[PDB]
Structures are given as C-alpha cells and as structure tokens.
Design a protein around this ligand. Structure first.
Ligand SMILES: [Zn+2]
Ligand SMILES: [Zn+2]
Ligand SMILES: [Zn+2]
Ligand SMILES: [Zn+2]
Ligand SMILES: [Zn+2]
Ligand SMILES: [Zn+2]
Ligand SMILES: [Zn+2]
Ligand SMILES: [Zn+2]
Lengths: 146, 69, 77, 64, 76, 146, 63, 64, 77, 146, 77, 146
C-alpha cells in the first residue's frame, strides 16, 4: 500500500487539480487531511471544505474511508460528514486515486441525487424549492466553510 | 478526413499502477479488448476475487500473462 | 479546429481533435476510440463540475489547450 | 525488474502500427504485432510466430 | 451486493460479491477475512455442499442470504 | 463438557437452525436426539431423518458419537445407522458444534464417497447405475422417512 | 470493524477468556483460553479453525 | 473471571485500526497495537512498548 | 482486605486486592500476574512520587480505593 | 501523529494527573505548553514549572522534545531547561503519553539521579548536604516558580 | 554461479543465471520462464552447431558471458 | 514487405552476425546475397558458401526463397542449391529474419536428416560410411568454397 500511497502524494505535489489538495500531516502515510474548494457559480462558491482520509492496509484493493469534517448542506452527505457515494463502496476501482476521488466528490456537490438521498429532509427541499435550497446551502457555506 | 499517425505506448514501461513496482505484463481481457496497466501478480488478485476491470469496469474474462518478444 | 487534453483515469494525458461545437458525447466517443473505455463509464469534469452529454464544448467555455479530467461513472445516494 | 522497452517499437511484421494485437493462447500472450497483422494470422489459421502454439484469439490491447 | 457467511464458531461475516462470483471466489474472500485456507472450507446452502466452479447465480443465492461454513470433510 | 453442551443448547434455543434440530432426551445432557430435513432437489427430498447423539466426557476434545435411527440409503451409512465420516473420527475439530456436525452430515447425503464405501453394494450401484441409485434412495425416503 | 467477539469466553470450555492465541507462521487464531489451547498443542492437534499445525500457544494480554 | 473489554478499542499507537498485531516474547504476548504499527516496531528492532522485552515476532491475530 | 486501582501505561484502570502491609514489590508482583509486565519495568507513582520496592502501601498512606499511577521504569541522567 | 495527539488532548481534558496539565500553544497541534506543580513535601512545594513540548512528525514512534522554561534546581536538569532522562531518548516507548511523561518528570523532581548527573555541582550537594540542597531548591522555587 | 546471454528470435538479448553443469534442456526451461517459448520448439545454436538437451554447458566449453543463439525448431527433409 | 526488409537490414548493421553476412544485390531490395562460414569441427570448416535470397511480395507472411549458389555436399541440399528445410516451407514463421534463417541453415549442415533426404545417393553414403562423407564434403568445400 505504502508505495502506491507515496506515488499519489508525489503526483499531488507536482500536479494537483485546481479544486483539491490532500496529504498527511505527520509521517503517518495512512491518514491524510484534504480540502475541496466549493465550485465557482454554485451555492458553495468561496468555501473551503475539509475532509479526512483513512487508507486501509490493503489499499488500493479496498477504497479509502473519506468523510467531511466541515459541515455541508447536501442531500448525499449527512451531519456526520458521511458521503453516500458508490465509488466509496461497491463501485470502487483500484485505478482511482485520492486526486480523482476528491474531484469526483467535488463534481457531486453540484450533481446530487435527491431521489435516493442520505438526508431526506434536504432532498425534499432540493426537489420542491430549488431557490430555498440554494439560499440554505449558501448560508451554510458562509457559516461553516469560511 | 485528415491523415492519422500511428501512436505508440510510451507509458508501457511505467510500473504497474497498483503496486508501482513490477512491469505491466498482466493483461485484463474482456471481449476482444484488453487493458494492460497492471502486473500479472496484481491482476490475478483482482480476477481471483471476481473484481471488474479497474479502468472500464467490464468483467474480467481472463488475465493473460503478456510477453514482449 | 483545436486540440484539448484529457487526463485519463490513470493520470496519462491524451490529445483530442475537436470543434468547439462538438457535443460532450462526441468527446466521449473519441475517448472510447483512443482508450477502449465505454462512454457510459466516462465522467468528464471541468472547473469542478461534470459535463452533460447533450451540451457542446462552447456551452462550457472550453477553449483550445483546455484539459478535461476523466473519472469513472459515479452515483450519489 | 526488466521493463518492456520493446513494447514501444512498431509491429515486427508491418513495421508501421503499434504493438496492440496480443496473440493469446491459454493464459499467456505474445505481444509483437499490430491488431491488423495479428488478425491476418488468426484468419489464416497460422500459429503464434514466436512459440508456435495455436492462436486462441487476438485481443486489441490498450495501455491505459 | 452483500451476502452473509456463518463461520465455524457461529460468528457471522459480510462479503461483497457479484452474481458471477464462483464459490472459489467466495472462499478466497473468506480467507482474506478469517485466515482459513480455501481447501479446508466447505460451504453449505439448503443442505447441500456448494461446489467450486459454480456461481452464486447458478445456485440462485439471494442478496443477504446466509451461507454456512463448515470444515472440509470426506465420507468413507 | 457440561458447560460447553449447555452453551450449545442455549444457542440452539436462542437461534434455531433451518436444516436441523437437536436437544437432550429428557434429563441426561450427554444423550441427545436430532432431526435432519432431507435436502430439497435430491432423492431424500421431503424426508425427515432422526439421529442419536452421545457426548463423551471430554467433549469437545473428542467427537460426539452420532448415528441415524431412521433408515437411509447411502454408501457411507449402514443398517446400524453408523456414519463413516472423517470429521467424526480423525479430522474432528473442537470448534465443531453439534449444529455444524448435523449440517455437515446433511451435506454428505448428496456428496457420498463410493470409492471407500461403508456399504459396498450401494456404492457399486452408485458408480454403475445412477438413475437406479436415485430411484431406490427416493423409495427408502418415502418408505422410512415420511 | 473491531473484534467484538474477543470479549466472549473460550469456545471450548465456555468458561475462561480468550487468552490462548494459537500461532502458526505469522498468523494466529484467538478463540480459546490458554488452558484449552495448551491441551491441543500438548496432543499435537491442529488449529480447530484452520487445521494448520500449532507452532505455539501464546498467553495473550490486552494491556 | 474478567474478560478483555478493552479489546474493541483502537490500536494505541495510530488510534485507528483494530488491535490485531500481537507482540510475542517468550510465552506471552501483548496485544494493544495493530499489525501495521507493531510490524513497524519489529522492523526497527524496538522492544515491546509496554514491557520492553525484545520482540520475538508479530502475529497477525484473527478472532474466529 | 482493601481494593486499590492502578491506572496502567495505556490508560486502562485495573483493580487489585491488597493489604496495607503489602510492599510495593508485592503490588508489582500482582500487576505482573494481571498484565504480564515484569516488576523491574514498573514504576508506581502516588501523589507525584515514586513508591520504593521495600516499603509498604501504608508507609505511603495509601488507603482503600486509592489510585496508583503506573509508568515505565526510568532513570534520570 | 495527529489522531494520536488529539486523543491525548481529550484525555487531559477528562482525567489529567493531579500535578500535570498541557495543551496546544495556539492552533499548532504539534507545539504544546505544560505545567507541573511542585509535589507536596518537597523543596519545590508551591512552585509551578512551565515546559515546552514539540511532537516530532512521526510521533509516537519518536519521543517528544521536552524542556523546562521555568528555571529549576535539580541534578538532571540544567540552566537551559534541558532534561537528561532516558525515557526522552533511548528508553522512549510509543505507549508513553504526554500525561505519562509529565507524571514521570514529576517523579524525577523528588527522586534525582546524582550518580549520573547533568549538573555535577548540584549532585554533590544533593548527595552530601541535603539540608543545603533543599534550601537552595526552595529559594529557586520562590525566585522563578512563584 | 555464472551468467550468460541468449539472443532470442527477434534479436532481443536476455540474461540467464546458469551453472556450467546445467543441461541444455535446463537452459531451455529458463528461456521458457522468461519468454513463454516451449522448449520443444527452441533450437539453441552456438558456433554454428545445434546444442542437444543431454549435454551441459561445460560439455560445449561454454564460458561465462557467452551468447547462445535461439532459432525455431527445424528439420531438413 | 519493404519496411520489414529495411528493418532487417538496419538491425544487421547494428549487430552484425558472426556466422554469416547478407545484403541486397545492388538496387533490388527484394533480391539479396548472403554468405555462410562453414562451421568449425566440421567438413565445411574454412569454407565460404554463397546463397541467393528472394523475398516474395507478402514477406514475412510467406518465407523467402533461399538457395545456395556455391556448390555444397549435403543430403538435404541438391546440385541446384535447393534446400529442403521445413522452416522454408510449411514450418515458416513471420518472426524469422534472414539472419536467423541463415544461422538455421548453418546448423542444418551438421544436423542432416538422412531418413527423408533430398539427395538419396548422398544420404546412403551418410548412413553407411561416415568417414567417406566427410572426405567428400571437405573436398567439395576446398574445390568450391575458397
Ligand atoms: Zn502490480
Ligand atoms: Zn478494461
Ligand atoms: Zn502490423
Ligand atoms: Zn506465442
Ligand atoms: Zn477454554
Ligand atoms: Zn488457525
Ligand atoms: Zn496502529
Ligand atoms: Zn510486552
């Protein structure tokens, strides 16, 4: 696992995506901290969202555990920062890297699935009143992600 | 329609994308196509656990140990 | 008209020959020809957002020498 | 570890297209021809050029 | 999808499988979790040994069904 | 042995098995009766088979003595109801509980060993005429286990 | 997930805690007490769960 | 007797992974770290964190 | 006769059965039986001070339901 | 190192040793300040002694750097606050926590090692004139630790 | 013991680790491991003559750093 | 055909063979000339044999036509220079290169097949008097190959 994790870290040092950063804090390669900037022209714009990453010891055969530590208003992410996303469970691929996973999560921010949600109350509002949804997510970004 | 040059796989000498150590000789076959980006050791581990191809998710028909004469 | 770049799943970068009027689904079919990846497994991302199949490159302000980011098909839930 | 530097050279038959036609036999494969040239061999029921085993299939081989 | 395996002590574990998983694929995943070599694993469902070479769909085994693990055995 | 047997009984009560049932014959905790449901899709289908179980005093270091009391047609089970099966002899394991032994015995019904049989005449028939084998085994099931 | 069954008694004697780790190679199966496991090793029995031979019994503390 | 209720607590080193790396010395073992962390100690030729006896081996511990 | 507690090196708290006339050497023997730690790697601390081997619990005014703190044997130098 | 350090901080909020406290200086989780109260019935009685802690990047495999910032009269601690003590170096264990290190240092104040001293002049006084040792230590406690 | 070189069918040169007592058939087995060529279709030539599976490298006075030449099994007629 | 032939010629320039030499006759890249050194420890020792090579249009799917233009004495080559050899007909392979073909022919010199001969007269003399064959071959070599 370590060698693969070291290659991904070097890649992030040389060519990170615009939206996302991640790395260990000490020498512990199995635990990373990450950030995603809210995409421009979204309710999340101008926010920085922190996540925690735990690599299992049989990485990359098994997915990393990824959770938000910054509160975010979204139908597929709950108040514990849990992200109900299939590439984090049954649709993981060993060819995915942390960089690609953060980019995928970032693309989930503006493409939620309200039809099968993790947080029902937020999906109802997303379907029945998009403006209120945008209002609220914007307020949450200002309150917690800034 | 413009002339298309052949292009050759310069990434073929990079190590297996899973273990980052061994050469890419474990070809993942599905239908009439193959994705060659892992060593035989790492690709057999996927096949032995009936995991799909990492880059296209098609089911792994077979792993082919690939020699380059 | 112009070339764009696509950072594929493994990190390798490929060059594509596109018109600004090309649909996103057009780009995916080019990626299939180059890489053998079925279009329904391709999720293309630009400026942190995924690109919808029935829109054009110009509909997304994608200029020449732009880089698109290829990840796998995903479903929130 | 010996990495396949010769995988980047052209098809040993036509010397023009890349080596993307793997000649499969059982669980091993010999990769030295392009897909077009290797299909000609398979179509004509010829054996593998370097090991003479029968050609089970030609696999169009990508390096993603 | 997920299935359950009731192991030798009665402890129940969860496995991630496809309908195309063969029984040997399942034993390999049991070994990953429990360190039991596949050739000493014997899996039983509806009173019958499940055979290497056949798949979960061959046996119409359902999502969240429970397979029963015993030790390799031989009559005589 | 007593505490371990009591544990198994309470587990059976708290969580009854689908394929078999077993408990003490009255007061002696070392002598039990059991029942095996014949496997569906087999010559034994629909049959119910009774067995006796005697635990030795150093159970579970030693195997239980297990015998059928219902007649059954099989190369490895004889007219005394004796079962020649390696996990009841040299391949026993203290981690086998009586529920696991019974499920194992049940799986032996469609997985006989005719090359080292306890009843040679049944095994010869099994090896030479399989339809004749299944016919009889269904006959014995309807005559004796229904 | 974590070993919740490690708190349960030895599966053999159902009395003492699981502190007799049965070792083979670089792996071990911990499901029995030291007394019951030492008995198995004394009699050259294999591991009850994986049937590998028993290299040694380790008296296992959780500090 | 007393059963080991602290066995579901995480490795005391990384505070994350389960306690499955038994540190063996003589006939006893101290199980308070994960296999990954205990293995790192063994490779660096460190003694047992709680009793300082030399580390004989690290055992990947399963709980069947 | 009385119960005392020991907060061991990992933070886990254990209970011992002792006499006031029990020596510290004796207490460390009991910790060894419960935890598998040789007494010479044990250093017991009460009220900010280490407890000497040949002195008794009562020599330190250690009464029923006290808590001792276990650290590793150390040497100033 | 981070999640281990957060756990140690949680333990100091919930159940700290009687004489010892510690926490991050500002937002830097790898730089702490600590206090040790002079133990009762000792020449340090009534003094409070401040320390600096730096966790290394691969804590807890490597020990923290620990120094007094309050001046103190002791055979194994010098005028710069450097502590010569084997658990901070060759006898470190990754099972030691800041709490346990501080308690250990606390026990060293009352049980010096004058036979292998960092400050030989103070050790000679400790071994041969304990009345003057206690007196000067008391004076330094009043001059620097009150 | 020693190492030698084999010029394979395409001209690609490979390296083997051998002992001077190794049989020709033993070398072919190492060639099959590195290149997937069945020994019964291998023909090793050295100094213009064929090497037969019974003898050893010492039999043919093959010193270390010698290059053996591989062609396909052939038969006159 | 042409590019492959070109490729074989460049590779010859890069790693010249020791048993043979070969290249185009002037202008026609499809018409080649080759020489073979007779093997040492053999009746052709010290001889230089010339060959003519013609490549068909669908080389390398079809073999080259290779014939000796230097008279030689051998059961599998006749007075016209024709070589009856399986790799030049049904056992051809597109991985064979002219260099490998020539070295194969050289090793056939000391490995004739008398049991299915091209020249029966030479064959019979090869089976019944080995000593005569080598005299004759050395004479033919002296007469024609120097
Ligand atoms: Zn690999
Ligand atoms: Zn694929
Ligand atoms: Zn070609
Ligand atoms: Zn081949
Ligand atoms: Zn026990
Ligand atoms: Zn075991
Ligand atoms: Zn750990
Ligand atoms: Zn220890």
């Amino acid at each position: 696992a370590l060698k693969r994790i070291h290659k991904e870290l070097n890649d992030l040092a040389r060519d990170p995506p615009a939206q996302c950063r991640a790395g260990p804090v000490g020498d512990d390669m199995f635990h990373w901290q990450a950030t995603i900037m809210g995409p421009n022209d979204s309710p999340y714009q101008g926010g920085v969202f922190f996540l925690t990453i735990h690599f299992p010891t049989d990485y990359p055969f098994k997915p990393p555990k990824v959770a938000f530590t910054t509160r975010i208003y979204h139908p597929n992410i709950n108040s514990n920062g849990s992200i109900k996303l299939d590439i984090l469970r049954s649709q993981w691929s060993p060819a995915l890297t942390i960089s690609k996973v953060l980019l995928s999560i970032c693309s989930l921010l503006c493409d939620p699935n309200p039809d099968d949600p993790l947080v029902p109350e937020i999906a109802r509002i997303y379907k029945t009143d998009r403006e209120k949804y945008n209002r609220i997510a914007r307020e949450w970004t200002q309150k917690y992600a800034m | 329609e413009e002339i298309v040059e052949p292009e050759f796989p310069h990434n073929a000498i990079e190590p297996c994308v899973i273990c980052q150590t061994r050469p890419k000789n474990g070809c993942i076959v599905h239908g009439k196509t193959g994705h060659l980006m892992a060593c035989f050791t790492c690709a057999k581990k996927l096949k032995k656990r009936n995991k799909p191809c990492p880059v296209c998710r098609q089911p792994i028909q077979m792993i082919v140990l690939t020699y380059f004469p | 008209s112009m070339q764009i770049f696509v950072k594929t799943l493994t990190g390798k970068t490929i060059t594509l020959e596109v018109e600004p009027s090309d649909t996103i689904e057009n780009v995916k079919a080019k990626i299939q020809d180059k890489e053998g990846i079925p279009p329904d497994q391709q999720r293309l991302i630009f400026a942190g957002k995924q690109l919808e199949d029935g829109r054009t490159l110009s509909d997304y302000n994608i200029q020449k020498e732009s880089t698109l980011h290829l990840v796998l098909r995903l479903r929130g839930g």
